[PDB]
Ligand binder design. Sequence first.
Ligand SMILES: NC(=O)C1=CN([C@H]2O[C@H](COP(=O)(O)OP(=O)(O)OC[C@H]3O[C@@H](n4cnc5c(N)ncnc54)[C@H](OP(=O)(O)O)[C@@H]3O)[C@@H](O)[C@H]2O)C=CC1
Ligand SMILES: CCc1nc(N)nc(N)c1C#C[C@H](C)c1cc(OC)cc(-c2ccncc2)c1
Length: 157
Amino acid sequence: TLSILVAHDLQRVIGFENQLPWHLPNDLKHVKKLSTGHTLVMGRKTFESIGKPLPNRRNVVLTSDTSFNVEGVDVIHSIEDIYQLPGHVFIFGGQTLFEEMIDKVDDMYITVIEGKFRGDTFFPPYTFEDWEVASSVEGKLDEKNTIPHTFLHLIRK
Ligand SMILES: NC(=O)C1=CN([C@H]2O[C@H](COP(=O)(O)OP(=O)(O)OC[C@H]3O[C@@H](n4cnc5c(N)ncnc54)[C@H](OP(=O)(O)O)[C@@H]3O)[C@@H](O)[C@H]2O)C=CC1
Ligand SMILES: CCc1nc(N)nc(N)c1C#C[C@H](C)c1cc(OC)cc(-c2ccncc2)c1
């Protein structure tokens, strides 16, 4: 199973100066629920921005640096190596990798942040003509989750 796992805002911003533009604890738990026990693939810049691999799942980093090695991180150097990964595999970031992968994945788990942030990293444009809406669930606003957001699970037609 090959999926995209992304959060972007109303203009597809997914990042600004190595950071998430928004603090949204509910989306983290959403990420933890979907990806625990499975595989996360990410480009080198996405990984360095987190700074440590995420617990209780396989962390795979794509890079051309043959010296790259991090404890708890499996390295690949080829787009093609992604397809040799066993199990449910999530493309986690960033813009470059999504651009390479958005035409290959079976489905996408998008968190739409109903806001307009300043960004420098973008999720690629996509149209609903090509994706069926398997589910659309609004996140709940509260104390710590203060921006409207929506979980989409889109499947390719
Ligand atoms: N929401 C998110 O996913 C967030 C992501 N980011 C980031 O993404 C931003 C923009 O950078 P972006 O380039 O999209 O990040 P990526 O995570 O996609 O990293 C790109 C890197 O991945 C490696 N790579 C990609 N494709 C291949 C390939 N086909 N073969 C071998 N290696 C490959 C290269 O690593 P190498 O150069 O080592 O060879 C390349 O430089 C960064 O500023 C960073 O902060 C920032 C905040 C949030
Ligand atoms: C959740 C945000 C998020 N949500 C969804 N639904 N998909 C995603 N792919 C990401 C994402 C992301 C990037 C990799 C990111 C950047 C970052 O910059 C500091 C910190 C984290 C992060 C710190 C702590 N735990 C998990 C992830 C993740």
